Amino acid sequence: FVNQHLCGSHLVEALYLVCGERGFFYTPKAAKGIVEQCCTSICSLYQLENYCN
Amino acid sequence: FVNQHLCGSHLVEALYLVCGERGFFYTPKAAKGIVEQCCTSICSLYQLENYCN
């Protein structure tokens, strides 16, 4: 579920599933942040975990 | 959708819907943080927005 284009609630859902009890931060307006890395291009577990606490 | 018990993906979904493009942080292990305020007791828009960026 992580190795695809993930946007909006689909992206937030992946962060929830990956980060578990650590939680995460979702900052879609951050330049070259998660939207560019996971929504406009293909996401990865490696990148998603950059956003777990 | 905000004025009820909200846990797990249901809570993350509400933060997504409320915070919009500001994004948010989801920190479930924070003592007296969002889990106590929105999951084990009834959530509110006022409290959810404390977690928007």
Curated annotation (Swiss-Prot), chains A, B:
Q: Tell me a GO biological process for this protein.
A: glucose homeostasis
Q: Read off the SUPFAM superfamilies from this record.
A: Insulin-like
Pfam families (UniProt xref)? Insulin
Asked if the Swiss-Prot or TrEMBL record annotates the protein with the keyword Ion transport, the reply is no
Where does it reside? Secreted
Cysteines joined through disulfide linkages: C7-C39, C19-C52, C38-C43
Q: Name one GO cellular component term.
A: extracellular space
| Entry keywords, A to Z | Carbohydrate metabolism, Disulfide bond, Glucose metabolism, Hormone, Secreted
Q: Name the Gene Ontology molecular function terms of this record.
A: hormone activity
Fetch the InterPro entries from UniProt: Insulin (IPR004825), Insulin-like (IPR016179), Insulin-like_sf (IPR036438), Insulin_CS (IPR022353), Insulin_family (IPR022352)
Say if the entry is tagged with keyword Disulfide bond: yes
Family the entry assigns? Belongs to the insulin family.
Task performed by this protein: Insulin decreases blood glucose concentration. It increases cell permeability to monosaccharides, amino acids and fatty acids. It accelerates glycolysis, the pentose phosphate cycle, and glycogen synthesis in liver.
Quaternary structure and interacting proteins, as annotated: Heterodimer of a B chain and an A chain linked by two disulfide bonds.
* Protein name listed in UniProt: Insulin
